[PDB]
Amino acid sequence: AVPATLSWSPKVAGVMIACNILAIAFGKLTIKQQNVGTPMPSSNFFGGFGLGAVLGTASFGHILGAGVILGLANM
Amino acid sequence: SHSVKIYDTCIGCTQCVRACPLDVLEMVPWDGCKAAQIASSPRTEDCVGCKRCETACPTDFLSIRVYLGAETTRSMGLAY
Amino acid sequence: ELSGQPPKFGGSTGGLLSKANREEKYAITWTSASEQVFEMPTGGAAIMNEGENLLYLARKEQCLALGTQLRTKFKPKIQDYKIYRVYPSGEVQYLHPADGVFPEKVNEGREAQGTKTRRIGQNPEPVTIKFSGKAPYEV
Amino acid sequence: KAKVSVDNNPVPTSFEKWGKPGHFDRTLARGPKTTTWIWNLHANAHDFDSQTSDLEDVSRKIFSAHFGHLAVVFVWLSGMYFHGAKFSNYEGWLADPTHIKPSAQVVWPIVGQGILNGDVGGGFHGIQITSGLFYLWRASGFTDSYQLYCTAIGGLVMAALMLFAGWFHYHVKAPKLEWFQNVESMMNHHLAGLLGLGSLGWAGHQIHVSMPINKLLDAGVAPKDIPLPHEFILEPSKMAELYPSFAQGLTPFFTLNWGVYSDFLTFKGGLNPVTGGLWLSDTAHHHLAIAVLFIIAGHMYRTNWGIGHSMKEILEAHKGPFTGEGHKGLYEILTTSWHAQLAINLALLGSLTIIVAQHMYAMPPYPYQAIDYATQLSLFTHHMWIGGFLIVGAGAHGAIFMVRDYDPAKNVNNLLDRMLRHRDAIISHLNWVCIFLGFHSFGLYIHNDTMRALGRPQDMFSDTAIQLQPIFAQWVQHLHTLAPGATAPNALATASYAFGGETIAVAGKVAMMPITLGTADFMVHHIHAFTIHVTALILLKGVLYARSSRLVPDKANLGFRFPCDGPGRGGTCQVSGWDHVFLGLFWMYNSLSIVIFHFSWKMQSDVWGTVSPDGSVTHVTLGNFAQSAITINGWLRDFLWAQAANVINSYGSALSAYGIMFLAGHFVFAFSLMFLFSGRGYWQELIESIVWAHNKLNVAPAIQPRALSIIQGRAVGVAHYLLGGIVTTWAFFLARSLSIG
Amino acid sequence: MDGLKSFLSTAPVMIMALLTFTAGILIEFNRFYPDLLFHP
Amino acid sequence: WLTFYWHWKHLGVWSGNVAQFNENSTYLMGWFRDYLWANSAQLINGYNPYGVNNLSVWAWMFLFGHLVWATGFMFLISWRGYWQELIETIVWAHERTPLANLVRWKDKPVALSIVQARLVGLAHFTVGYVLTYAAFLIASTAGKFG
Amino acid sequence: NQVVQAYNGDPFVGHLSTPISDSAFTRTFIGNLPAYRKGLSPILRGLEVGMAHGYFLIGPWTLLGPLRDSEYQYIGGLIGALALILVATAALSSYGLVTFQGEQGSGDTLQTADGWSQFAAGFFVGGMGGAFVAYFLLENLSV
Amino acid sequence: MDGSYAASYLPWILIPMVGWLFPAVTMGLLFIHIESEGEG
Numbered sequence A: 001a002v003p004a005t006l007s008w009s010p011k012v013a014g015v016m017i018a019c020n021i022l023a024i025a026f027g028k029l030t031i032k033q034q035n036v037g038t039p040m041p042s043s044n045f046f047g048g049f050g051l052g053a054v055l056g057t058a059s060f061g062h063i064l065g066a067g068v069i070l071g072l073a074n075m
Numbered sequence B: 001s002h003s004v005k006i007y008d009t010c011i012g013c014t015q016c017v018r019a020c021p022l023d024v025l026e027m028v029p030w031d032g033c034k035a036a037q038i039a040s041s042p043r044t045e046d047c048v049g050c051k052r053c054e055t056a057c058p059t060d061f062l063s064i065r066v067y068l069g070a071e072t073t074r075s076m077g078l079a080y
Numbered sequence C: 001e002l003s004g005q006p007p008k009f010g011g012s013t014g015g016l017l018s019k020a021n022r023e024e025k026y027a028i029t030w031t032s033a034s035e036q037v038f039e040m041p042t043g044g045a046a047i048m049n050e051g052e053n054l055l056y057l058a059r060k061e062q063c064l065a066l067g068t069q070l071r072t073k074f075k076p077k078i079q080d081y082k083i084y085r086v087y088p089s090g091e092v093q094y095l096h097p098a099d100g101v102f103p104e105k106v107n108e109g110r111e112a113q114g115t116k117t118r119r120i121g122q123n124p125e126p127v128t129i130k131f132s133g134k135a136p137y138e139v
Numbered sequence D: 001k002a003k004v005s006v007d008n009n010p011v012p013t014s015f016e017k018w019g020k021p022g023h024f025d026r027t028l029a030r031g032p033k034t035t036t037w038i039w040n041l042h043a044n045a046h047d048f049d050s051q052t053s054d055l056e057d058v059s060r061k062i063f064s065a066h067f068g069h070l071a072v073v074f075v076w077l078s079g080m081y082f083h084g085a086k087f088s089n090y091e092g093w094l095a096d097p098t099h100i101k102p103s104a105q106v107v108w109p110i111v112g113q114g115i116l117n118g119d120v121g122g123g124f125h126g127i128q129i130t131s132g133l134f135y136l137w138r139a140s141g142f143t144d145s146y147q148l149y150c151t152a153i154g155g156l157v158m159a160a161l162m163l164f165a166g167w168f169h170y171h172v173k174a175p176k177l178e179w180f181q182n183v184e185s186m187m188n189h190h191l192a193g194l195l196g197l198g199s200l201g202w203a204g205h206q207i208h209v210s211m212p213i214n215k216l217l218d219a220g221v222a223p224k225d226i227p228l229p230h231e232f233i234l235e236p237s238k239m240a241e242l243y244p245s246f247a248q249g250l251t252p253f254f255t256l257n258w259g260v261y262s263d264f265l266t267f268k269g270g271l272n273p274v275t276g277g278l279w280l281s282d283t284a285h286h287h288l289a290i291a292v293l294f295i296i297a298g299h300m301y302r303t304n305w306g307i308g309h310s311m312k313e314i315l316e317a318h319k320g321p322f323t324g325e326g327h328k329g330l331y332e333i334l335t336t337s338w339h340a341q342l343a344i345n346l347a348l349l350g351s352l353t354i355i356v357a358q359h360m361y362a363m364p365p366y367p368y369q370a371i372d373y374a375t376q377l378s379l380f381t382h383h384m385w386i387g388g389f390l391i392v393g394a395g396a397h398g399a400i401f402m403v404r405d406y407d408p409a410k411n412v413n414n415l416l417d418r419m420l421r422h423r424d425a426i427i428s429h430l431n432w433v434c435i436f437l438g439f440h441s442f443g444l445y446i447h448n449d450t451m452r453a454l455g456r457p458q459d460m461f462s463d464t465a466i467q468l469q470p471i472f473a474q475w476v477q478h479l480h481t482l483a484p485g486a487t488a489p490n491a492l493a494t495a496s497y498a499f500g501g502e503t504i505a506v507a508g509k510v511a512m513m514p515i516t517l518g519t520a521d522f523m524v525h526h527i528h529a530f531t532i533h534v535t536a537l538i539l540l541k542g543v544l545y546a547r548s549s550r551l552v553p554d555k556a557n558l559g560f561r562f563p564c565d566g567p568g569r570g571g572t573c574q575v576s577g578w579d580h581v582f583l584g585l586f587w588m589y590n591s592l593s594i595v596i597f598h599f600s601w602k603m604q605s606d607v608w609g610t611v612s613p614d615g616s617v618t619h620v621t622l623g624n625f626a627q628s629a630i631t632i633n634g635w636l637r638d639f640l641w642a643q644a645a646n647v648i649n650s651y652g653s654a655l656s657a658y659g660i661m662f663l664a665g666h667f668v669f670a671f672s673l674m675f676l677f678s679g680r681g682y683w684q685e686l687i688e689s690i691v692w693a694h695n696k697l698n699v700a701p702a703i704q705p706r707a708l709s710i711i712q713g714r715a716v717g718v719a720h721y722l723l724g725g726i727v728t729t730w731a732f733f734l735a736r737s738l739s740i741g
Numbered sequence E: 001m002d003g004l005k006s007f008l009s010t011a012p013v014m015i016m017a018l019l020t021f022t023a024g025i026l027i028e029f030n031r032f033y034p035d036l037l038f039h040p
Numbered sequence F: 001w002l003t004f005y006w007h008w009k010h011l012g013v014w015s016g017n018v019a020q021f022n023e024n025s026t027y028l029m030g031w032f033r034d035y036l037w038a039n040s041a042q043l044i045n046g047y048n049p050y051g052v053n054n055l056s057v058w059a060w061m062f063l064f065g066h067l068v069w070a071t072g073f074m075f076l077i078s079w080r081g082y083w084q085e086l087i088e089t090i091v092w093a094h095e096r097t098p099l100a101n102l103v104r105w106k107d108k109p110v111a112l113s114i115v116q117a118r119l120v121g122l123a124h125f126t127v128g129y130v131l132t133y134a135a136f137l138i139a140s141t142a143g144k145f146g
Numbered sequence G: 001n002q003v004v005q006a007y008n009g010d011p012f013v014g015h016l017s018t019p020i021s022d023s024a025f026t027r028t029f030i031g032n033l034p035a036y037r038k039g040l041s042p043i044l045r046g047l048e049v050g051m052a053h054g055y056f057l058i059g060p061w062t063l064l065g066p067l068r069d070s071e072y073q074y075i076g077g078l079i080g081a082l083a084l085i086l087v088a089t090a091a092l093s094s095y096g097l098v099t100f101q102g103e104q105g106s107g108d109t110l111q112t113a114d115g116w117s118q119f120a121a122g123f124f125v126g127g128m129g130g131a132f133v134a135y136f137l138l139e140n141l142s143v
Numbered sequence H: 001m002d003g004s005y006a007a008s009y010l011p012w013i014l015i016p017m018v019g020w021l022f023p024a025v026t027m028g029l030l031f032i033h034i035e036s037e038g039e040g
């Protein structure tokens, strides 16, 4: 009775990509300092983010995607 | 209360006076030492007997001694 | 009478007790040049008012410890603090300094008390004064 | 491109100061005049705060000394590995773990101590070891002595590395104070790069090395035929045939199809039937999850890119109505005073060590650890004593901080000020609860003792009489027994069989069985509560009243370590915080002694024993705990006198070294009483007479001998006392546990 | 160096060196001639 | 020391087993095992989970002495200032408690003086010493021969 | 919402105003107790106090005493309660005898020699009454 | 709690007085005397 996980499928990619987008949207409204440290080459496409902010929100996106995918695969 | 006695070997170094936390000791002019001052104990009714004055005396043995006698509220250091 | 605004303090459980209202208490007054913070001898820290400050304590040792702290722990040295004893009947007895001059320095006019005219090795033997109500140092 | 900021060559490397002892202290620098100068020298050495007023220099000294202690620990570990490689029967024990006693110390026969080299099985003579290194090594995938030798060599190399690191990072390139104060970056690196990375590396070791070797070992494969660990890496088919999921490679990992790895990453729970230890797959998933959690946690504090919370902001934002300023001002305290950090870390580490000792025995991780009763008892007692000492040290260094580094100006109406402002209520309520616990716990024992002595067993506090059933503990045990069913559905069995379930037995001995709780367990647990609350009372009174009190209003001006304030005020002996620590050491000793005694007797009486092929379990002491541990006479007769036979009758055998030590323990204790019961004036007068004697013959020493100071006398008394008592208990426990099969 | 020489000559190093020498003498003598209860 | 020597020698004499004392009295472990551990078997069994015999009072007094002896250590080791401060806290607690301020002490409670503490600790110590040895001696001799 | 301050607005008094030491409910409940009630004579105060302090003393000996499993359980509890009340009355009388030998004022009628004597007598009577009524409730038949 | 000696009823009344009555009586008398502020 091991919990059931999913083999890689386009649905998994879409789900966690939605998670990434929502994580970025949430991070833009919550991070106190968003333009400190090493910056992007062209911040216009990143909404005034530095490298740290982009990496943090992307890591948060992968984390939320992993959690959501595993939870959905369980049920 | 306790009895604080000062003998004639005092040299007027004031260490006993400064070490007293309850302000029992004092300095009064004298003529037996270079400093021309000797310690005095005019307020022995406030002394508790912590022996800091004896601890601070630099002379051989002590020019100041504290003999613990009748215990009062002030001597016993009671705040209640 | 005693005049002064109490320092800004939140209070504590280490303050006075029934002895102050039944036996006696003590008071200390001092003029602070500027408002600052000082350690309560009963615990904690209290902000003292600019100008004249008045404070009640339970023992003379606590008042003198506070006075030493005032004299030694602030760059503008506080030298004008006065310590009185407050009786329940309302009588105020002025204690420290005795004559306006600190006891650490010699001042003309004081009378020598408790001074013996002999070395400590010249005290009489107990057997010579036994059955009397005295002690070798007392004679 | 870093926050690194160091000073180059601040302290030259020279040997002159080696020849001038006491160089650090101005008081001891000018030279000795009395013998006290010696005792001060060894006492104020590693107190860097008093030597200099520079925080940066103190921090640099602390960093270097910490490197030194790391080097010492590395030397100790490498020595353990070397002595287990050369002078041990680990290779012999590995083939037959259930018939050969572990042994790694061998004695030279010189004056008859060769009798200590008793037979440990398999034709090997040596001292049986209870440190449990053999089980750790087997669980670590050790099969050959050469591997242990290589580990010892690596440990020596790393110890040399740490020594050189200390020398470089102090005498050559010393970090600046601002570098030391990057607490956010320090926590980031230590939470992620140390705990998370270390746990991930250990999980990798366990999966890629420990699992195949232990799977082969438990399956009956001879230790000499098991492939070397690197063979599994070099030949992945060997790993795949042991675990089929390894045939799928790392593809299921990055695709989040983690269930593929279910065969070797399980949630079994319970214990391995073959060895009696935990499943290695459970530990693998455990350490992997721990690594993931710690690596996630290590990114919390913002360091250099503005992403992450700031500790000062969190501290200053949590403040409520009852606290006024709340946690404001603590950040400056903990970033400028080493003593506060030392206190907090010591308390947490001591509690963690007690947790370790409490959690190892109930679920033994290492193979065959449960089947070796001596190893269980030794490990539990050892780490318990370590934890107790660390907690007492926390209570000490907290008072040290309060005396020295506390500044009232920056702590106005914060949490510390309101500590100092309602401390009297705290101490009074704590004193009341201590007295109440002492009465309603120890008076129960005394009442039972009197009822039994009066021939009234029906009036006792016993399971056959008035009963004090720990209903809450029994209920939580029942809840944890039902956890594998529905509350933790993906668990095969319980976390530990101590809560309940089946009796796991290895060979002919019980590895772990349910531990029921009755009236005796209730009474002993509440006795533990009473002792712990009393020790907390002593240490907390020491910390809170360190600055001053009603009796002494300027205690902080005297310092942390002063003997008294004189016979005034009726007598002011032992008012410093140091004396509070000295008093709390005894109470910690008493509490830990009761704890280890309870553990030992309960384990012997209701847990350990032997299993017959019929399935019946015969315990070591035939289950006399439930009926004897309710009276003090029961503890005296059925525990001390009864179980001391194996140590008193140890003469003429290999266990004789214990019996000797047992008597040794009974000696120093008594010796300590000649420091604790007396004072230094009498000894000073006696030394005066002896000095006259040595003066008569013109042999008087230039260094004038003086009797020990009051603080030093108390310290010597408590030290020799604890040494004697702990040595007594250690000898008793070892001689008892090495004789109950 | 001079400092190393001075450090080696401090009291603890001297007393422990003398104790080690004496202990070695006694242990070796008892290795070669044990059970010496009296002069025969 | 004196009484232990006398008692062990005479136990050997009375039982006729002088050999036990003669062999085992030359090393301290024999004193520990053949005298203390051996002769305590019946004393501690004065009252038992299974019953009570006539030595019960002696076992109870044996434990009583082992307790008073330890109690003396509290006065012998811990000194005045700690208890004085604790009494300060207790005085504050009593004075601040409602329904208890109606009752006040006639004499201000203070901690025992230094010399008084030494005397009290020595008294508890000596009483425990005497009671413990008397109980052990009487119980051992009564069980063996009485 | 600084609900915790000094006792009676006096920071130099060793006490603090806390939600249980100076709350309005606390003062209202305490002041209405028989000891602290307004206008009550010491005899009536002692009677009222002894009522409860003797009523609640029937319990422990009844449920745990040596006769707790006997036909005489409640009688034993009653006897123990009565003896303890007698000892308490003796202690109260001694305290009143030794505490008010100085001045005999009138600031508090309870804190006086005559007032304390009346209080102790009322306490004795109330303790007897409370113990007896508790026994009457608890005892079955035996009438 | 009976005995076969002559006048077995005596300890039934004597022991309580020595146990409760006499101790309490002297206890209170001494307590009153030591706090008697009549003189000095």
Ligand code: CLA
Binding pocket: A003, A063, A064, A067, A068, A070, A071, A072, A074, A075, D490
């Ligand atoms: C809609 C999306 C979704 C869905 C359907 C699920 C569904 C599920 N998740 Mg899940 N998850 C999600 C999103 C989702 N998750 C996200 C976004 C994350 C990232 C944060 C996670 C992270 C996550 C973890 C880490 C775990 C799950 C688990 C589970 C499963 C069991 C949870 C449960 O109720 O049992 C548990 C029910 C309980 C009552 C247990 C709660 C009691 C705990 C142990 C107390 C812990 C106290 C703790 C120390 C306090 C915190 C301290 C400090 C932070 C203040 C369940 C199928 C669990 C699993 O794998 O189950 C097999 C599991 O371990 N999820």
Ligand code: CLA
Binding pocket: D062, D063, D064, D066, D067, D070, D179, D180, D182, D183, D185, D186, D189, D190, D192, D193, D194
């Ligand atoms: C990943 C980064 C990292 C790691 C692993 C550590 C680890 C440690 N730090 Mg630390 N530290 C770091 C970053 C790190 N620090 C940063 C960035 C700062 C500046 C803010 C500090 C500032 C600092 C101070 C001020 C102090 C420490 C101390 C310590 C030690 C505490 C003792 C201990 O845990 O025992 C466990 C011991 C071990 C696990 C032994 C490890 C031996 C070496 C040093 C580990 C090297 C591993 C390295 C990653 C290469 C191995 C990888 C691979 C080849 C296997 C510990 C070794 C204390 C100390 O003095 O120790 C020296 C101390 O007081 N740290």
Ligand code: CLA
Binding pocket: D042, D043, D044, D045, D046, D047, D048, D049, D342, D389, D390, D391, D392, D393, D394, D396, D397, D400, D560, D561, D578, D581, D719
């Ligand atoms: C990580 C642990 C740690 C660290 C770094 C420190 C650091 C420090 N402590 Mg601290 N302490 C600790 C744990 C720790 N302590 C614990 C656990 C306790 C409780 C026992 C204490 C109790 C304590 C006190 C009471 C005092 C300090 C003091 C000090 C300061 C240096 C003075 C000193 O002790 O050196 C000198 C060290 C010694 C003289 C120790 C040598 C003698 C030991 C006791 C012998 C031990 C015998 C051994 C266990 C067995 C040998 C058997 C034999 C037969 C061979 C320094 C800040 C002192 C201080 O105030 O400085 C500010 C001080 O007075 N500490």
Ligand code: CLA
Binding pocket: D431, D434, D435, D436, D437, D438, D439, D442, D443, D446, D534, D537, D538, D583, D586, D587, F067, F070, F071, F072, F073, F074, F075, F077, F078, F086
């Ligand atoms: C066996 C020896 C012994 C005993 C019994 C005690 C007892 C006590 N110590 Mg103690 N102590 C001892 C040795 C001992 N100490 C030693 C050696 C040291 C040196 C380190 C200390 C250091 C020490 C400190 C530093 C502290 C204590 C504290 C306490 C008290 C804790 C409250 C308590 O236990 O409940 C009440 C007492 C008991 C349960 C003891 C048994 C009483 C019996 C069961 C009752 C008798 C029944 C009845 C009254 C008899 C009627 C007959 C009539 C004639 C009276 C208690 C009075 C603490 C304290 O002040 O209290 C919080 C405290 O802070 N002790």
Ligand code: CLA
Binding pocket: H010, H011, H012, H014, H015, H018
């Ligand atoms: C000092 C001598 C002494 C001692 C220790 C005892 C001891 C005892 N007697 Mg006893 N007795 C004694 C002399 C003594 N007797 C004499 C001389 C008489 C003849 C009048 C009696 C007549 C007597 C009776 C009739 C009874 C006892 C009983 C008892 C037992 C109960 C406790 C008790 O004494 O109270 C009760 C007994 C008395 C109050 C008798 C009066 C004591 C004598 C007359 C005065 C002794 C004063 C003493 C020297 C004061 C010392 C001061 C010191 C504390 C500083 C106890 C074993 C009772 C018993 O057997 O219970 C089992 C019992 O019923 N005794």
Ligand SMILES: CCCCCCCCCCCCCCCC(=O)OC[C@H](COP(=O)(O)OC[C@@H](O)CO)OC(=O)CCCCCCCCCCCCCCC
Binding pocket: D318, D319, D320, D321, D322, D323, D324, D326, D327
């Ligand atoms: C569960 C097992 C059985 C245990 C039952 C015992 C319960 C007895 C007491 C109830 C617990 C109440 C905690 C509320 C306390 C709480 O909620 O604090 C809240 C309050 C602070 O509230 P604020 O919102 O102002 O807090 C701001 C915070 O962010 C910190 O600044 O703290 C105080 O009022 C401190 C006063 C506590 C003084 C009483 C301390 C009691 C000490 C004894 C504790 C006994 C239980 C010990 C066993 C663990």
